[PDB]
Design an enzyme around this catalytic site. Structure first.
Site, PDB file in Angstrom:
ATOM      1  N   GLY A 117       0.965  13.686  -5.573  1.00  0.00           N
ATOM      2  CA  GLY A 117       0.634  12.434  -4.901  1.00  0.00           C
ATOM      3  C   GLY A 117      -0.122  11.438  -5.771  1.00  0.00           C
ATOM      4  N   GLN A 118       0.416  11.190  -6.973  1.00  0.00           N
ATOM      5  CA  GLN A 118      -0.321  10.622  -8.123  1.00  0.00           C
ATOM      6  C   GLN A 118      -1.302   9.490  -7.790  1.00  0.00           C
ATOM      7  OE1 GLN A 118       0.074   7.580 -10.276  1.00  0.00           O
ATOM      8  NE2 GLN A 118      -0.923   8.352 -12.146  1.00  0.00           N
TER       9      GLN A 118
END
Ligand SMILES: Nc1nc2c(ncn2[C@@H]2O[C@H](COP(=O)(O)OP(=O)(O)O)[C@@H](O)[C@H]2O)c(=O)[nH]1
Ligand SMILES: Nc1nc2c(ncn2[C@@H]2O[C@H](COP(=O)(O)OP(=O)(O)O)[C@@H](O)[C@H]2O)c(=O)[nH]1
Ligand SMILES: [Mg+2]
Ligand SMILES: [Mg+2]
Lengths: 180, 180
Positions: free
Chosen positions: A69-70
């Site tokens: 979920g950068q």
């Protein structure tokens, strides 16, 4: 973590390498660093929302961060991929839920161009847990057998007992040594 | 670091003190510690599952761990509790769903006879987000006013700009020097 100094005190040719250890968070990465007993775990936050743990032993250095979920979002990850000859991906084998998402983060990094020749070791971790998927379905679920042209290896571990870390790191130490 | 170094300067010599800094996860503690610039953030794991971050500045050590675990005050905590002079609790002001849970964990901590003499500083952190509860609401939802026989101060902060950190620690550093 003396049997662990004996694997890496051979690579010690002072060119300054990096082994990356990454995975979804709560996989076991900090625990695995702590068990190797190769030095202090020291945290830095190179940019906001980017916490990097690092044990430095001689010219060698392990570097851990979570993926998935950068953060804000920044990869100066790439200034990290530079001198990376080994990449370890730690997986929570019990977590059938986010298992397909580690697949993604694994595939995103391998798709990375500075990690073309980095050797891959996957720790299927939390093997002592009862629901833990075995190595055979971690491989299945990670699509590892579809990796042509990469040198890879999956090792069942339990980082709390320490079971599997020597064997997985023994292999990994081989490939780095055996090539260049 | 520099400015922050000099606050913690009269507490020196032989005394060997600890400032505990605890709170739910994602409140902003490693961020605050990194801002201090007093030394490297070394993680240890003294027992299964219990990560503890530490910055030694001379005789002054800053000790961090997350509270809210599923459920538990450990025997091991209370050994930490012994040389704790100050106690910093860090609250994610934007996290409205878990502030009550923040209240009990802190209520739980202050019920410890080892901590009865400890100066409490609440950092109401993440005051840069639009939906953040202010120091007045926080003081409310934690109920800092019901607190008899404890020295406390609430300080709104932003860990990432480093804003607010100096004045809460200005105050704490006095409570341990001039009183105490
Ligand atoms: N049952 C079991 N738990 C583990 C194992 N390795 C790590 N853990 C637990 O998993 C949690 C996350 O570990 P941590 O090293 O901090 O994770 P990371 O840095 O987020 O991936 C901690 O509670 C560890 O004690 C394992 O092999 N077996
Ligand atoms: N927006 C905002 N977030 C912050 C602030 N300080 C910390 N954080 C963030 O909250 C998250 C957790 O920070 P961290 O130091 O790791 O947490 P903790 O150590 O778990 O208490 C990270 O994305 C930090 O960048 C702040 O003052 N403003
Ligand atoms: Mg970690
Ligand atoms: Mg932390």
């Amino acid at each position: 973590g003396n049997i662990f100094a004996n694997l890496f005190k051979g690579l010690f040719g002072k060119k300054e390498m990096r082994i990356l250890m990454v995975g979804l968070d709560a996989a076991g990465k900090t625990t695995i660093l702590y068990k190797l007993k190769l030095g202090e775990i020291v945290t830095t936050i190179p940019t906001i929302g980017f916490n990097v743990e690092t044990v430095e032993y001689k010219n060698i250095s392990f570097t851990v961060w979570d993926v998935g979920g950068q953060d804000k979002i920044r990869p100066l990850w790439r200034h990290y991929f530079q001198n990376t000859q080994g990449l370890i991906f730690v997986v929570d084998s019990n977590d059938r839920e986010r298992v397909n998402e580690a697949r993604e983060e694994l595939m995103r990094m391998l798709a990375e161009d500075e990690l073309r020749d980095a050797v891959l070791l996957v720790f299927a971790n939390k093997q002592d847990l009862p629901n833990a998927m075995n190595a055979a379905e971690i491989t299945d679920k990670l699509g590892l057998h579809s990796l042509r042209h990469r040198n890879w290896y999956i090792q069942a571990t339990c980082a709390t007992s320490g079971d599997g870390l020597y064997e997985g790191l023994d292999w990994l130490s081989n490939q780095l040594r055996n090539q260049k």
